[PDB]
């Protein structure tokens, strides 16, 4: 206490004391501490007695933090632990990850699960990714400009149950449609060639089909052949309903019942 | 040159509106309410804290209606706006006290009318 | 830049001129 | 005494802050700039209460900063000489009494103090009782004063109080 | 009731492009898709063609009045 100025009553067990190992006598690391206490780490601090020294557990030449378990600054010893453990149906999902690598973990999810992730700009941005269709995903780049408040970021449970859960419930109904098709995710080249082949078997009855677009997620596609010319009408799925010709339908069925008595105009 | 003793003030503040203790108390508390909600925010400065805890000691009353009441009962008379707050915070118990503290009240009004304005302020005090 | 605004897009309606007759399928109920 | 005024200010915004956060960022900058500060012109501006408008941001030629003039309402505190205010005694010493007034403080020598209010340095609490020990004025005693002189010291104010006027004590 | 020419003069085009390219060089958010270029003047020119430059042009008349013209409102010439 008169020369080194550090007694055992200051250093306690449980608190982390940074022990700088500068050398080793014969398997240990005997160095000095911050208060001049000669920190001699035993072989139990490195976990090796007949092998090389604790180079992975104690930094040779530098200071290595360890949990203080012995107060012997007057005895020329320092029981500093070299180990880091000695110092101490619509499922939600959480993250922090890369867009490419994120694509591989949302293919194992089935319809309905929503992952939360950051976004490529790497700060402030975040994105709500959900199962628009088989092989099609939405990436709501919230500031897809979905303007929100600042208070909601502390509770991440309502932005899904108010904007995406009803959206997914609305999107699932079209998947269970009687006339749904993949067409390679709505390839614009594959869709025009199907309507011209289905019209020839039954020229009187004109069928209709729905598809999602991989080229622009959240666009559904509704093609109909009033005559010998393919025609494509787009529709956006909204958190509150559907955006069809700028008219908002509360329920999934009123869209179809509005279409059955609107597609018979000459346009 | 400027001297509140003779109601002479800089034009930029003569055009400015004086505030009561309980008034600024309510405004500051409202701010603090907004300034401690809306997460991801910066704490108020110590200036705001010391101004709050100052005026909190000298709140004669609190509800906006009490402020509006004392303001309306004062403005109906012919007092200058500078007299509005010094006379509304202190609440001198007698007209003689108000006229001794405020030299502008001396001869400004009959003692019984100034005393009535005081007594009204006293009755507004919680 | 793998993810711009997708729902902020403007769905352009396609105009046409088909002076056809009325021989199409009837409507249904909403339940 | 407290006040509020429509102030105006102008901020130079760096181009990094353009895009969707722009006007919100201008607001945040103004709250960063002019809150909690005192001025030789207007005295102690306590805070902006509201923004009257954000002007059209002129792009500075040859440097990308855009200059936004902004007009805004702010609460402000500007004491004047002659004003008789409520205050709280903070420190009682034989050198003089020290007292706080909103953001500011005042100081009151024994010279300003009536002769009967002798020093009490020998009691634990510093006081200025009278000789019969009836009117006990001590620290933290909500004592009135009259601002007899103003002084601004580098964006701060430091008045001087007095006790010469009658009825300057306990209510 | 804007009475000035509805065309972007070549002076307004030079200044708008240089100013916007400066803003881009100072890391301003771009208003147009970058197909993979990096010169701020090339970006500013693309934005000009996309009419997405977030700049309005205050044209002073000789009486000292002024008119404000977006950079999407008036007809870009070249």
From TrEMBL, chain B:
GO process annotations (BP): DNA-templated transcription initiation; transcription by RNA polymerase II
UniProt keywords, alphabetically: DNA-directed RNA polymerase, Nucleus, Transcription
Main localization, broad class: nucleus
Locations listed in the record: Nucleus
GO molecular function: nucleotide binding
One Gene Ontology cellular component annotation held by this UniProt entry: RNA polymerase II, core complex
Positions of transmembrane segments: none
UniProt entry tagged with the keyword Kinase: no
RNA polymerase Rpb4/RPC9 core domain residues: 11-126
Source organism, top-level taxon: Eukaryota
Function: Core component of RNA polymerase II (Pol II), a DNA-dependent RNA polymerase which synthesizes mRNA precursors and many functional non-coding RNAs using the four ribonucleoside triphosphates as substrates. Pol II is the central component of the basal RNA polymerase II transcription machinery. It is composed of mobile elements that move relative to each other. POLR2D/RPB4 is part of a subcomplex with POLR2G/RPB7 that binds to a pocket formed by POLR2A/RPB1, POLR2B/RPB2 and POLR2F/RPABC2 at the base of the clamp element.
UniProt similarity note: Belongs to the eukaryotic RPB4 RNA polymerase subunit family.
Protein name: DNA-directed RNA polymerase II subunit RPB4
Organism of derivation: Sus scrofa (Pig)
Shown residues in whole-protein numbering: 56 to 181 of 184
From TrEMBL, chain C:
Subcellular location as annotated: Chromosome; Cytoplasm; Nucleus
Phosphothreonine modification, residue list: 3
Entry superkingdom: Eukaryota
Modified residues (Phosphoserine): 25
Record family assignment: Belongs to the RNA polymerase beta' chain family.
Role description: DNA-dependent RNA polymerase catalyzes the transcription of DNA into RNA using the four ribonucleoside triphosphates as substrates. RNA-dependent RNA polymerase that catalyzes the extension of a non-coding RNA (ncRNA) at the 3'-end using the four ribonucleoside triphosphates as substrates. An internal ncRNA sequence near the 3'-end serves as a template in a single-round Pol II-mediated RNA polymerization reaction. May decrease the stability of ncRNAs that repress Pol II-mediated gene transcription.
Protein name: DNA-directed RNA polymerase subunit
TrEMBL record, chain D:
GO BP term, example: DNA-templated transcription initiation
A Pfam short name: S1
Record domain S1 motif: where: 80-162
Keywords: DNA-directed RNA polymerase, Nucleus, Transcription
Recorded coiled-coil stretches: none
Nucleus recorded as keyword: yes
InterPro entries according to UniProt: NA-bd_OB-fold, RNA_pol_Rpb7-like_N_sf, Rpb7-like, Rpb7-like_N, S1_domain
GO cellular component, one term: DNA-directed RNA polymerase complex
GO MF entry, a single one: nucleic acid binding
Subcellular location as annotated: Nucleus
Stated family: Belongs to the eukaryotic RPB7/RPC8 RNA polymerase subunit family.
Function: DNA-dependent RNA polymerase which catalyzes the transcription of DNA into RNA using the four ribonucleoside triphosphates as substrates. Core component of RNA polymerase II (Pol II), a DNA-dependent RNA polymerase which synthesizes mRNA precursors and many functional non-coding RNAs using the four ribonucleoside triphosphates as substrates. Pol II is the central component of the basal RNA polymerase II transcription machinery. It is composed of mobile elements that move relative to each other. POLR2G/RPB7 is part of a subcomplex with POLR2D/RPB4 that binds to a pocket formed by POLR2A/RPB1, POLR2B/RPB2 and POLR2F/RPABC2 at the base of the clamp element.
PANTHER family linked: DNA-DIRECTED RNA POLYMERASE II SUBUNIT RPB7 (PTHR12709:SF4), DNA-DIRECTED RNA POLYMERASE II, III (PTHR12709)
Protein name as it appears in the record: DNA-directed RNA polymerase subunit
Organism: Sus scrofa (Pig)
Lineage of producing organism: Eukaryota, Metazoa, Chordata, Craniata, Vertebrata
Gene assigned in the entry: POLR2G
TrEMBL record, chain E:
Domain of life according to the entry: Eukaryota
Compartment annotation: Nucleus
Main location group: nucleus
Gene Ontology CC terms: fibrillar center; RNA polymerase I complex; RNA polymerase II, core complex; RNA polymerase III complex
One MF term in the entry's GO annotations: DNA binding
The entry's keywords: DNA-directed RNA polymerase, Nucleus, Transcription
GO biological process: transcription by RNA polymerase I; transcription by RNA polymerase II; tRNA transcription by RNA polymerase III
Function: DNA-dependent RNA polymerase catalyzes the transcription of DNA into RNA using the four ribonucleoside triphosphates as substrates. Common component of RNA polymerases I, II, and III which synthesize ribosomal RNA precursors, mRNA precursors and many functional non-coding RNAs, and small RNAs, such as 5S rRNA and tRNAs, respectively. Pol II is the central component of the basal RNA polymerase II transcription machinery. Pols are composed of mobile elements that move relative to each other.
Family, per entry: Belongs to the archaeal Rpo6/eukaryotic RPB6 RNA polymerase subunit family.
Protein name, as recorded: DNA-directed RNA polymerases I, II, and III subunit RPABC2
Organism: Sus scrofa
Full protein: residues contained: 50 to 127 of 127
């Amino acid at each position: 206490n008169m020369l080194t100025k550090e007694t055992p009553e200051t250093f306690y067990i449980g608190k982390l004391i940074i022990c700088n190992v500068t050398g080793i006598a014969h398997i240990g690391v005997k160095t000095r501490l911050d208060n001049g206490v000669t920190g001699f780490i035993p072989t139990k601090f490195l976990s090796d007695k007949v092998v090389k020294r604790p180079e992975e557990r104690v930094k040779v030449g530098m200071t290595v933090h360890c949990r203080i378990m012995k107060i012997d600054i007057e005895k020329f010893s320092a029981d500093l632990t070299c180990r880091t453990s000695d110092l101490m149906i619509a499922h939600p999902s959480f993250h922090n990850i890369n867009f490419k690598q994120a694509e591989k973990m949302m293919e194992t999810m089935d319809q309905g699960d929503v992952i939360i992730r950051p976004s490529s700009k790497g700060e402030n941005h975040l994105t709500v990714t959900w199962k628009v269709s088989d092989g099609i995903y939405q990436h709501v780049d919230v500031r897809a400009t979905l303007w929100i408040n600042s208070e909601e970021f502390e509770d991440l449970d309502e932005i899904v149950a108010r904007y995406v859960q009803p959206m997914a419930s609305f999107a699932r109904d079209l998947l269970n449609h009687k006339y749904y098709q993949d067409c390679s995710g709505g390839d614009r080249k594959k869709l025009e060639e199907l309507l011209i082949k289905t019209k020839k078997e039954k020229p009187t009855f004109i069928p209709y089909f729905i598809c999602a677009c991989k080229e622009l997620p959240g666009k559904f596609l509704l093609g109909y052949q009033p005559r010998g010319k393919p025609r494509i009408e787009y529709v956006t799925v909204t958190p509150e309903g559907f955006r069809y010709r700028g008219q908002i339908f509360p329920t999934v069925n009123g869209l179809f019942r509005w279409f059955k008595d609107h597609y018979q105009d000459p346009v | 040159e400027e001297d509140a003793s003779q109601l002479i003030f800089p034009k930029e503040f003569e055009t400015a509106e004086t505030l009561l203790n309980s008034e600024v108390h309510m405004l500051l508390e409202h701010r603090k309410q907004q300034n401690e909600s809306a997460e991801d925010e910066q704490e108020l400065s110590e200036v705001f804290m010391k101004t709050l805890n100052y005026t909190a000691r000298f709140s004669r009353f609190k509800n906006r209606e009490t402020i509006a009441s004392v303001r309306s009962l004062l403005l109906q008379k012919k007092l200058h706006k500078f007299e509005l707050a010094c006379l509304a915070n202190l609440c001198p118990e007698t007209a003689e006290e108000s006229k001794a503290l405020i030299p502008s009240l001396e001869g400004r009004f009959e003692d019984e009318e100034l005393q009535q304005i005081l007594d009204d302020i006293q009755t507004k005090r919680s | 830049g793998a993810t711009p605004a997708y729902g902020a897009w403007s769905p352009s309606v396609g105009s046409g001129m088909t002076p056809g007759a009325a021989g199409f399928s009837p409507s249904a109920a909403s339940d | 005494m407290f006040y509020h005024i429509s102030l105006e200010h102008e901020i130079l915004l760096h181009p990094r802050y353009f895009g969707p956060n722009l006007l919100n960022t201008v607001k945040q900058k103004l709250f960063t700039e002019v809150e909690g500060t005192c001025t030789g012109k207007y005295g102690f501006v306590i805070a902006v209460t509201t923004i009257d408008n954000i002007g059209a941001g002129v792009i500075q030629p040859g440097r990308g900063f855009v200059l936004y003039p902004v007009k805004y309402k702010a609460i402000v505190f500007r004491p004047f000489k002659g004003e008789v205010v409520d205050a709280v005694v903070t420190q009682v010493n034989k050198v003089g009494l020290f007292t706080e007034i909103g953001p500011m403080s005042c100081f009151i020598s024994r010279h300003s103090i009536p002769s009967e209010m002798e020093f009490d340095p020998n009691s634990n609490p510093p006081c200025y009782k009278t000789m019969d020990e009836d009117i006990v004025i001590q620290q933290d005693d909500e004592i009135r004063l009259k601002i007899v002189g103003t002084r601004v010291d580098k964006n701060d104010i430091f008045a001087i109080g007095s006790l010469m006027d009658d009825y300057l004590g306990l209510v | 009731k804007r009475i000035t020419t509805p065309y972007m003069t070549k002076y307004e085009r030079a200044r708008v492009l240089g100013t916007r390219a400066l803003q881009i060089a100072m890391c301003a958010p771009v208003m147009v898709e970058l197909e993979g270029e990096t010169d701020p003047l090339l970006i500013a020119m693309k934005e000009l063609k996309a009419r997405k430059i977030p700049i309005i042009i205050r044209r002073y008349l000789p009486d000292g009045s002024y008119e404000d013209w977006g950079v999407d409102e008036l007809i870009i010439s070249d």
